[PDB]
């Protein structure tokens, strides 16, 4: 059946010099010929212009890196066949991170203004230009980012039919392709599984347990009943696990409260005054194209992604050769 | 339900062209992996040559593949272009303006000098002739010949150094040259002078058409050459034998339609297959010019028959008939410029009559002449809105046929009329 | 008629050889179209 795969060396992704650039403070308005300060304003701005084109270069690095390891949910079709498929190992700075969308990232470079703000009276034009630099530029524009599932331990979903699912169908694919399936194992339990819904998530040698037959598929965890999927992983309770559900009702969070199973379910109601959304156990309403985290409304993704079953199934089959 | 198509993959080196036959009624996302292995971090897809990539969900039936078309292997369209963002309005002027090709450079000066020169020659000539036609003094003919000779040399002097200025400098050399010979034994702007000039440009042209190392300046030479030769004979025979009260044009419009109707053969008359592309265009350039010789001739006398007052009711139909004949003789010509040339014959002739009456102080047919242009303009528009009356496909076959006997039934049916105006058989 | 299996974009299978000799891996696309009474179209 399945051909074999080897463990190469992962191609070195483009670097990211995480420097901490230090800007020098402006002048202090002596209060002296006009042509004197006019000679210094033209001497500061001419300095910020060489630093504005220097701190704008750093950004194009992160956006080169972050995009190098989370391409749009169509490039990941050509990932499995080629020699860089399961490149990620458990020590990369991008380990167990799931591309959910793209929005404004905070530009990990420091941008320190090492100075002494005492008796403020700074030259006006030479001061306003500094702040303008520090706000617009300390954030990368639209950049592929997403969930750090390694320490999240709970997912909740709120939305309509063909959209609350497509988001899981969207990033659970990017979840597994970027690992050797020996390292992560998903768990699916859905009443409407085999109608163009989760059914296609069968073919995969990620959808395999150790040493099971089930007739046709390796594990075929794809079922309808929740207690059905769940106890078929009673031994599995360090490989990581994603128990998921498509049931609006029927009791999520019945297993935990672990060290590697992040649970998921879909609902239809939102809480009213939910107490302090943790850095864990988030709530993520899914609007037309947004993934709004429940907070107090914190968009947290400015344009989401959706993995249609047609380009979805085609992901499984190609990964079923190896 | 298989269909036979041929894909084209050229990204690596040159290109690889194979064909195949493929199972229709499927999302193309299923068959893409197969072709990727035959011919060969981005995604790919299929597209007809000349169109946009096809969706990965449609089928080769609903996206309209005919069994045997040539598809290409292009990429999924794009993503966002990732707009830059700069806050200091100062540098917002230097950054977003580079994308212009603005640099002064020592090539905006090359085009600079030559363009200045061609102006100097032209007004240098026209001054002297204006010093020669409205008043009279031959010092111009000194200066005419002076500049006329000079440009003659310069084109022959950079034939192998610029390869574009040369052919440009030749075409402008014939304006003063035609001016020079036209000044021997003046007359009243003279009877036989127009004989001397038609020799000059027909001389100067023929020397340079063969002198062109490439295309880009061939058609203008060819057309004016035949135009010079053409006017020479009907001017020469007009210089001694015939007095020809009005029948100069009767020779012209005859000679005109003759050149237009006999056009394909004349082009051939100027005639490893590696240098096929160079030979095919020159052939086309030859045809597109030769036809202009026809139209410009076709009006050349036609502007003189109905020119003055007291003309013939047979003279009025002697020009109109020609126009339609040439206008309906276009549907046989393939290229674009070939079509336009003969198509606008009536247009060019229309304005000729207008100025004629305004310069002839008529203020009667002038207005009509302006009303004879709109009718021609109006039909142009309705030809443009709906590609229906312009497209002969939504017609009838005998209509396509009737226009044939309509065509050859009139473009030649004026030589009997021709015998009337001159009264060639009234003798 | 004679219908048989075929990888997409290739000539159909040979009827008396197992798929494991032609090299069918678990997860291919095979088509039930007719059999060539002639050449395998290289």
């Amino acid at each position: 059946s399945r051909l074999i795969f080897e463990h190469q060396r992962r191609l070195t992704p483009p670097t990211t010099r995480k420097g901490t650039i230090t800007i020098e403070p402006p002048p202090q308005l002596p209060r002296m010929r006009t042509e004197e300060v006019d000679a210094e304003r033209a001497d500061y701005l001419r300095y910020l212009s060489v630093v504005r084109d220097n701190v704008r270069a750093h950004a194009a690095e992160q956006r080169a890196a972050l995009e190098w390891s989370h391409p749009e949910p169509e490039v990941l079709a050509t990932i499995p066949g080629t020699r860089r498929q399961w490149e990620r190992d458990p020590r990369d700075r991008d380990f167990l991170v799931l591309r959910a969308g793209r929005h404004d990232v905070p530009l990990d470079a420091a941008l320190k203004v090492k100075d002494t703000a005492d008796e403020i009276d700074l030259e006006p034009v030479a001061h306003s230009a500094l702040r303008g630099l520090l706000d617009v530029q300390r954030t990368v524009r639209d950049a592929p980012t997403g969930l750090d599932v390694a320490k999240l331990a709970r997912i909740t979903v709120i939305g309509e039919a063909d959209e609350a699912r497509a988001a899981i169908r969207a990033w659970i694919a990017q979840a597994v392709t970027w690992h050797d399936p020996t390292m992560l194992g998903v768990a699916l339990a859905a009443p409407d599984l085999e109608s163009g819904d989760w059914s296609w998530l069968k073919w995969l040698p990620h959808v395999d347990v150790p040493n099971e037959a089930d007739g046709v598929g390796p594990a075929r965890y794809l079922t309808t009943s929740t207690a059905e999927l769940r106890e078929r992983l009673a031994p599995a309770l360090l490989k990581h696990l994603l128990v998921v559900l498509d049931d609006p009702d029927a009791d999520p969070d019945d297993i935990a409260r672990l060290t590697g199973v992040t649970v998921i379910h879909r609902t239809t109601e939102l809480p009213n005054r939910e107490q302090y959304p943790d850095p864990e156990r988030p709530i993520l309403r899914v609007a037309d194209g947004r993934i709004e985290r429940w907070q107090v409304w914190q968009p947290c993704v400015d344009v989401a992604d959706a993995m249609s079953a047609a380009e979805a199934a085609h992901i499984a089959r190609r990964l079923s050769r190896w | 339900p298989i269909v036979r198509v041929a894909v084209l993959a050229a990204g690596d080196d040159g290109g690889r062209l194979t064909e195949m036959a493929l199972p229709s009624e499927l999302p193309l996302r299923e068959i893409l992996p197969a072709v990727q292995r035959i011919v060969q971090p981005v995604r790919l897809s299929l597209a007809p040559i000349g169109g946009a990539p096809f969706s990965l969900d449609a089928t080769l039936d609903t996206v309209g593949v005919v069994d045997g078309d040539l598809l290409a292997l292009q990429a999924v369209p794009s993503g966002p272009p990732a707009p830059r963002i700069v806050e200091d309005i100062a540098d917002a002027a230097v950054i977003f303006s580079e994308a212009r090709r603005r640099q002064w450079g020592p090539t905006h000066i090359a085009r600079g000098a030559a363009l200045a020169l061609i102006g100097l020659i032209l007004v240098g000539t026209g001054l002297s002739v204006a010093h020669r036609v409205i008043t009279g003094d031959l010092l111009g003919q000194f200066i005419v010949s002076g500049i006329a000779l000079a440009t003659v040399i310069a084109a022959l002097a950079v034939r192998n150094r610029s390869a574009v200025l040369a052919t440009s400098l030749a075409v402008t050399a014939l304006v003063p040259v035609a001016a020079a010979f036209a000044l021997g034994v003046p007359g009243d702007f003279g009877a036989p002078n127009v004989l001397l000039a038609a020799a000059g440009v027909a001389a100067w042209s023929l020397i340079s058409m063969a002198g062109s190392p490439d295309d880009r300046g061939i058609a203008v030479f060819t057309a004016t050459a035949v135009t010079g030769v053409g006017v020479l004979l009907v001017a020469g025979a007009a210089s001694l034998w015939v007095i020809s009260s009005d029948v100069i044009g009767c020779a012209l419009v005859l000679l005109g339609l003759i050149v237009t109707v006999q056009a394909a053969q004349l082009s051939a008359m100027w005639a490893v297959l590696a240098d096929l592309p160079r030979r095919v265009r020159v052939s086309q350039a030859h045809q597109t010019g030769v036809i202009a010789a026809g139209v410009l001739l076709g009006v050349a006398g036609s502007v003189a028959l109905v020119s003055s007052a007291n003309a013939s009711p047979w003279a009025w139909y002697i020009v109109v008939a020609a126009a339609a004949g040439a206008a309906l003789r276009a549907r046989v010509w393939d290229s674009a410029a070939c079509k336009a040339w003969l198509l606008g014959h009536s247009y060019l002739l229309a304005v000729a009559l207008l100025v004629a009456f305004v310069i002839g102080d008529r203020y009667q047919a002038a207005l009509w002449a302006l009303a004879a242009l709109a009718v021609l303009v109006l039909v142009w528009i309705v030809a443009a809105l709906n590609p229906k009356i312009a497209s002969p496909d939504t017609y009838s076959l005998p209509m396509r046929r009737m226009v044939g006997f309509l065509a050859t039934g009139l473009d030649a049916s004026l030589i009997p009329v021709m015998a009337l105006l001159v009264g060639l058989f009234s003798l």
Side-chain angles (χ1 to χ4, degrees), chain A, chain B:
Chain A
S1 157
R2 286 202 147 119
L3 262 293
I4 211 66
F5 200 70
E6 64 276 13
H7 193 70
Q8 294 286 328
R9 174 56 59 204
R10 62 158 317 153
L11 287 155
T12 319
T15 174
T16 166
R17 306 164 289 119
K18 295 202 291 292
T20 84
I21 179 52
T22 94
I23 313 335
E24 141 147 25
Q28 282 188 353
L29 189 59
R31 171 59 175 84
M32 184 54 74
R33 304 205 80 253
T34 69
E35 313 318 280
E36 216 287 327
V37 286
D38 278 23
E40 204 191 19
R41 308 158 155 177
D43 203 356
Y44 204 52
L45 309 159
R46 231 212 46 237
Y47 159 36
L48 272 219
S49 152
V50 133
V51 124
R52 161 212 320 318
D53 274 319
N54 181 1
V55 117
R56 175 152 138 260
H58 276 171
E61 297 287 354
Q62 286 186 0
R63 183 203 300 272
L66 289 170
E67 195 276 348
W68 161 266
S69 71
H70 317 297
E72 296 109 4
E74 306 110 5
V75 180
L76 83 173
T78 81
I79 285 299
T82 179
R83 65 168 303 282
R84 197 189 59 121
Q85 57 159 351
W86 311 337
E87 60 178 354
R88 295 182 187 175
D89 64 5
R91 302 157 267 92
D92 317 279
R93 78 278 187 190
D94 51 352
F95 181 52
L96 313 180
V97 304
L98 269 62
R99 176 193 219 256
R102 56 169 60 242
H103 75 110
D104 306 337
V105 182
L107 186 71
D108 186 68
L111 268 300
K112 181 161 288 299
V113 182
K114 143 258 331 245
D115 71 356
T116 331
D118 166 26
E119 246 161 25
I120 246 14
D121 47 6
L122 309 177
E123 162 77 3
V125 61
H127 175 40
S128 55
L130 173 67
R131 298 311 157 171
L133 172 67
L134 280 189
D135 309 355
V136 185
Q137 300 291 348
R138 266 200 289 194
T139 66
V140 194
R141 286 295 97 84
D142 267 9
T145 193
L147 321 168
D148 179 24
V149 75
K151 61 199 54 48
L152 203 60
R154 166 55 145 171
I155 302 290
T156 46
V157 170
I158 297 167
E160 65 269 18
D162 78 304
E163 179 190 272
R165 325 179 304 259
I168 297 286
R169 191 177 71 246
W171 69 69
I172 195 166
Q174 194 251 320
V176 312
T177 319
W178 286 117
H179 309 78
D180 44 2
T182 170
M183 274 305 309
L184 170 82
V186 310
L188 171 52
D192 182 13
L193 68 162
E194 294 169 38
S195 299
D197 206 328
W198 311 114
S199 167
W200 85 265
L201 297 143
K202 191 74 74 151
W203 270 269
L204 288 180
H206 212 83
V207 193
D208 48 351
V209 312
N211 184 210
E212 199 170 24
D214 213 322
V216 54
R220 294 199 65 236
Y221 271 146
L222 284 79
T223 173
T224 289
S225 296
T226 79
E228 174 52 87
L229 160 79
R230 170 179 45 189
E231 306 321 327
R232 216 182 324 190
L233 291 92
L237 182 145
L238 276 301
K239 298 322 165 154
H240 279 331
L241 305 86
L242 275 296
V243 52
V244 311
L245 317 165
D246 207 78
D247 50 352
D249 59 344
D251 179 22
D253 204 9
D254 61 70
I255 300 179
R257 303 307 166 192
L258 270 77
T259 318
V261 197
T262 314
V263 315
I264 296 97
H265 86 279
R266 80 173 281 173
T267 326
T268 56
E269 62 86 19
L270 308 100
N272 70 337
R273 216 52 44 86
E274 199 61 35
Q275 297 83 19
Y276 306 116
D278 205 52
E280 297 173 353
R281 42 208 80 198
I283 294 96
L284 303 92
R285 190 263 274 265
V286 175
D288 50 357
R290 299 182 169 277
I291 302 181
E292 268 154 35
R293 273 199 276 112
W294 172 262
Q295 192 68 90
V296 180
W297 197 11
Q298 279 63 240
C300 186
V301 161
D302 293 27
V303 53
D305 43 7
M307 189 166 277
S308 175
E311 185 50 32
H314 184 274
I315 281 290
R317 219 175 311 124
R318 292 184 60 85
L319 188 55
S320 190
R321 293 183 184 178
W322 285 265
Chain B
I2 192 161
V3 294
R4 297 182 65 83
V5 297
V7 310
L8 194 156
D12 44 359
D13 45 4
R16 315 263 313 284
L17 167 54
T18 88
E19 83 170 32
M20 39 207 63
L22 276 192
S24 70
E25 202 158 29
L26 268 186
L28 195 147
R29 61 180 55 83
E30 296 291 356
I31 88 181
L32 172 55
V35 285
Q36 255 181 339
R37 314 163 306 113
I38 292 187
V39 286
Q40 291 273 341
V42 301
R43 182 137 209 178
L44 308 185
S45 175
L46 307 191
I49 52 147
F54 281 166
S55 188
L56 283 181
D57 184 59
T59 189
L60 320 173
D61 305 340
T62 63
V63 66
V65 172
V66 182
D67 199 17
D69 38 41
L70 170 47
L71 271 62
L73 181 64
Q74 297 187 230
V76 73
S78 71
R84 201 191 273 95
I85 177 57
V86 281
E87 56 93 6
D88 189 7
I89 294 89
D91 278 286
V94 63
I95 293 300
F96 293 172
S97 44
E98 290 295 316
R100 161 68 187 70
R101 182 33 180 138
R102 80 197 186 289
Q103 307 73 2
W104 179 238
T107 168
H108 286 253
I109 324 162
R111 186 183 309 127
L115 266 180
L117 181 42
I118 302 313
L120 170 72
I121 280 171
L122 259 297
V123 73
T125 288
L127 164 69
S128 80
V129 170
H131 199 76
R132 199 49 208 82
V133 77
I134 301 314
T135 194
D137 186 4
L138 271 302
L139 179 64
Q141 182 160 358
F142 185 80
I143 302 288
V144 169
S145 42
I147 294 284
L149 172 72
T151 183
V152 162
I153 308 306
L156 310 167
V158 188
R159 176 156 315 277
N160 55 66
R161 285 287 302 258
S162 89
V164 58
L165 159 67
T167 55
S168 72
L169 199 37
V171 185
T172 179
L174 71 92
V175 175
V177 157
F181 295 167
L183 268 193
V185 184
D188 201 293
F189 195 79
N193 297 358
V194 314
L195 205 161
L196 281 77
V201 310
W204 177 235
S205 181
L206 299 184
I207 311 153
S208 288
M209 161 156 55
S212 178
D214 45 350
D215 196 338
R216 195 73 80 102
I218 274 172
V220 49
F221 280 143
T222 288
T224 189
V226 168
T227 311
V229 168
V231 65
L232 171 47
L233 324 183
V234 296
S239 158
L240 61 96
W241 163 53
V242 61
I243 60 168
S244 166
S245 63
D246 282 349
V247 309
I248 312 93
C250 316
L252 288 162
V253 174
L254 275 178
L255 190 43
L257 60 87
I258 285 158
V259 182
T260 283
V261 68
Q262 191 82 290
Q265 286 73 14
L266 267 299
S267 165
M269 188 270 277
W270 268 277
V272 59
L273 73 162
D275 286 327
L276 181 57
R278 206 183 81 108
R279 287 211 277 95
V280 58
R281 290 177 327 152
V282 177
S283 70
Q284 177 60 244
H286 279 145
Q287 321 186 4
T288 295
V290 164
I291 300 160
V295 153
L296 178 49
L297 277 174
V299 53
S302 199
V303 61
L305 268 55
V306 188
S307 49
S308 89
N310 63 86
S312 172
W314 295 121
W316 277 109
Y317 156 99
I318 240 325
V319 259
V320 170
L328 262 8
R329 171 158 350 93
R331 295 315 158 172
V332 72
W333 276 113
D334 184 83
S335 161
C338 294
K339 245 176 235 63
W341 261 117
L342 16 127
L343 223 317
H345 163 14
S346 30
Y347 200 68
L348 178 18
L349 137 64
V351 10
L353 314 187
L354 192 175
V355 160
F357 302 122
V358 141
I359 209 38
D361 314 8
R362 202 74 63 97
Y363 338 117
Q364 232 186 95
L367 329 128
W368 285 124
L370 192 168
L373 238 182
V375 284
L376 179 54
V377 153
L378 193 152
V379 57
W380 261 105
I381 306 164
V382 295
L385 269 186
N386 49 358
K388 155 189 178 170
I389 321 184
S391 61
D393 296 334
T394 319
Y395 286 174
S396 159
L397 186 139
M399 282 174 172
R400 189 54 162 199
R401 195 179 80 251
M402 274 313 299
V403 78
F405 193 88
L406 172 81
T408 173
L410 66 94
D411 66 85
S413 315
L414 83 172
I415 172 68
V417 196
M418 188 53 100
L420 319 180
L421 282 301
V422 59
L424 185 66
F425 69 118
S426 160
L427 181 52

